[PDB]
């Protein structure tokens, strides 16, 4: 009901966060570790595999900015890199910090019953899935309000 | 002749004409009205008590016919005094109930026929929750009847 909490808001950003947005970097980070290759003659930064993982470090925060010397065309290559590193995990990050703070508005509050939901389903299935044992099968709650 | 059953029965319906022939019995056989054998043996009620609990519009004139005769054989302080025992509503007396049931005519009532009004209602019934519960008050007709807004 603290650690329950936690563990559905994880749950439901996973669902919610790869397809909108693990597919969206993907794509930015596709783009311009794309452009990157073409840019680079020799020197195994040439590969797609190998330019698009310095890519990624830059999101990390391992990135490497100009760490290749190879290639031809100066600067340009670094505005490239420029770009894409002020671009892509800067750009991208705020909006996808500001949708979670406008839920952030509401539905943390909306859901600590949806934890409720999955221990019910554990407790019923236990039962169920217990054998069902021999077990409870009145309800009544004790009250005072006044109201008087 | 009566037993417990007999009077209880006649409480419960508020009947004051089967009760016509209850003075004169125990005249014959003295018993008294507060006997042993006129209580629950488990909790301690007697017929006013029962009477108590078997309100209809907060009325019932077999309180007023019980005291009477509870007077004319003098068991009147220790009838209209009388508790509780199970752990439950244990020192609970007919005053209590009157309260409890915001019923100033029976309290008036029972004050002038001498309830105690220092009564303690201190079983488990008047104390927190178990949750049994429940309820607090603690205890003393006052406390009670400030407890309870009145």
Same mark, same amino acid.
């Given at each position: 009901?603290?650690?329950?909490?936690?563990?559905?808001?994880?749950?439901?950003?996973?669902?919610?966060?790869?397809?909108?947005?693990?597919?969206?970097?993907?794509?930015?980070?596709? &783009?311009?570790?794309?452009?990157?290759?073409?840019?680079?003659?020799?020197?195994?930064?040439?590969?797609?595999?190998?330019?698009?993982?310095?890519?990624?470090?830059?999101?990390? &925060?391992?990135?490497?900015?100009?760490?290749?010397?190879?290639?031809?065309?100066?600067?340009?290559?670094?505005?490239?890199?420029?770009?894409?590193?002020?671009?892509?995990?800067?750009?991208?990050?705020?909006?996808?910090?500001?949708?979670?703070?406008?839920?952030?508005?509401?539905?943390?509050?909306?859901?600590?019953?949806?934890?409720?939901?999955?221990?019910?389903?554990?407790?019923?299935?236990?039962?169920?899935?217990?054998?069902?044992?021999?077990?409870?099968?009145?309800?009544?709650?004790?009250?005072?309000?006044?109201?008087? | 002749?009566?037993?417990?059953?007999?009077?209880?029965?006649?409480?419960?319906?508020?009947? %004051?004409?089967?009760?016509?022939?209850?003075?004169?019995?125990?005249?014959?056989?003295?018993?008294?009205?507060?006997?042993?054998?006129?209580?629950?043996?488990?909790?301690?009620?007697? %017929?006013?008590?029962?009477?108590?609990?078997?309100?209809?519009?907060?009325?019932?004139?077999?309180?007023?016919?019980?005291?009477?005769?509870?007077?004319?054989?003098?068991?009147?302080?220790?009838?209209?005094?009388?508790?509780?025992?199970?752990?439950?509503?244990?020192?609970?007396?007919?005053?209590?109930?009157?309260?409890?049931?915001?019923?100033?005519?029976?309290?008036?009532?029972?004050?002038?026929?001498?309830?105690?009004?220092?009564?303690?209602?201190?079983?488990?019934?008047?104390?927190?929750?178990?949750?049994?519960?429940?309820?607090?008050?603690?205890?003393?007709?006052?406390?009670?009847?400030? %407890?309870?807004?009145?």
């Amino acid at each position: 009901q603290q650690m329950g909490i936690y563990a559905v808001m994880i749950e439901k950003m996973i669902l919610r966060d790869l397809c909108r947005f693990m597919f969206v970097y993907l794509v930015f980070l596709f &783009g311009f570790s794309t452009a990157v290759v073409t840019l680079i003659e020799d020197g195994k930064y040439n590969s797609l595999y190998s330019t698009c993982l310095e890519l990624f470090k830059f999101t990390i &925060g391992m990135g490497d900015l100009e760490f290749t010397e190879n290639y031809d065309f100066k600067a340009v290559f670094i505005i490239l890199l420029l770009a894409y590193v002020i671009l892509t995990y800067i750009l991208l990050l705020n909006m996808l910090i500001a949708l979670m703070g406008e839920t952030v508005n509401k539905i943390a509050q909306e859901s600590k019953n949806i934890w409720k939901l999955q221990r019910a389903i554990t407790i019923l299935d236990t039962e169920k899935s217990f054998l069902k044992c021999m077990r409870k099968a009145x309800x009544x709650x004790x009250x005072x309000x006044x109201x008087x | 002749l009566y037993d417990r059953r007999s009077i209880f029965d006649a409480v419960a319906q508020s009947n %004051c004409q089967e009760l016509e022939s209850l003075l004169p019995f125990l005249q014959r056989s003295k018993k008294r009205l507060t006997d042993s054998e006129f209580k629950d043996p488990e909790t301690g009620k007697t %017929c006013l008590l029962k009477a108590m609990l078997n309100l209809h519009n907060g009325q019932n004139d077999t309180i007023a016919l019980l005291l009477d005769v509870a007077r004319k054989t003098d068991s009147l302080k220790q009838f209209v005094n009388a508790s509780y025992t199970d752990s439950y509503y244990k020192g609970q007396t007919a005053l209590h109930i009157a309260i409890e049931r915001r019923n100033m005519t029976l309290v008036t009532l029972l004050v002038e026929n001498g309830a105690d009004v220092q009564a303690a209602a201190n079983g488990d019934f008047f104390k927190k929750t178990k949750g049994r519960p429940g309820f607090y008050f603690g205890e003393l007709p006052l406390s009670l009847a400030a %407890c309870t807004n009145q």
